[PDB]
Design a binder for this molecule. Structure first.
Ligand SMILES: [K+]
Ligand code: NA
Lengths: 217, 15
């Protein structure tokens, strides 16, 4: 009903042209660079395993090829999204070539969009990390990006890593007493689990991501 | 956030 777009990985002339077009068709453009969960649609020049793309997937947004906005321009209104989804057979047929990484990111975006939007049609909005209550233990340079990615998918990020937080926590991610968290029914996992959870067709085996101090639990 | 800087950061994978 109200279309709200962000743009990623586009050239400058494209960005200007598409912002103009979106506004002309009655959409809103979020011009700020970080992912904003207010958006409904993201148009990306190529999939990347970065925070903005993974956050769009974790939130189940429409992740669309630029040919979507060319179809809108021709129609003079926002058209049906499905055939312009990055993971769609229609787009994968449209491309001359795609690397396995980009194909996997494209299929992940479509898989999560279908799941999250099917539930939305039934009156529940939940992201890929719904029910996660997370302790982060990462390098300061990485903390804010992990927090933004987890919150985009619906996770609650707990304030710090003190022992009282282990009771409510579901997950602790490390790049603090790990064995005590593990003893309090916290999955204590390497940070690779987050991208791999979004990307893998079936949920990753936690055993492959379990931090050393937690292997017993 | 440092969105422009952090945008470069590729999240780790066991793949
Ligand atoms: K717990
Ligand atoms: Na804005």
């Amino acid at each position: 009903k109200q279309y709200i777009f962000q743009l990623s990985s586009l050239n400058p002339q494209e960005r200007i042209d598409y912002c103009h077009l979106i506004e002309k068709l009655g959409g809103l453009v979020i011009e700020k660079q970080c992912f904003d969960p207010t958006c409904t649609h993201i148009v990306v020049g190529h999939p990347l395993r970065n925070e903005k793309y993974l956050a769009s997937v974790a939130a189940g947004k429409w992740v669309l090829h630029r040919s979507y906005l060319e179809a809108c321009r021709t129609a003079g209104h926002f058209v049906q999204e499905e055939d312009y989804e990055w993971g769609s057979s229609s787009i994968l047929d449209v491309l001359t070539g795609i690397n396995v990484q980009q194909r996997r990111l494209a299929l992940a975006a479509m898989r999560w969009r279908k799941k999250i939007q099917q539930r939305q049609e039934s009156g529940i909005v939940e992201g890929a990390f719904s029910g996660w209550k997370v302790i982060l233990h990462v390098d300061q340079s990485r903390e804010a990006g992990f927090k933004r990615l987890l919150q985009s998918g619906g996770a609650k990020v707990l304030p710090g890593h003190s022992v009282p937080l282990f009771k409510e926590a579901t997950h602790l991610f490390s790049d603090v007493n790990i064995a005590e968290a593990a003893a309090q029914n916290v999955y204590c996992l390497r940070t690779e689990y987050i991208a791999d959870y979004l990307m893998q067709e079936s949920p990753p085996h936690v055993e492959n991501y379990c931090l050393p101090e937690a292997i017993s639990f | 956030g440092a969105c422009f800087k952090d945008a470069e950061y590729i999240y780790p994978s066991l793949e």
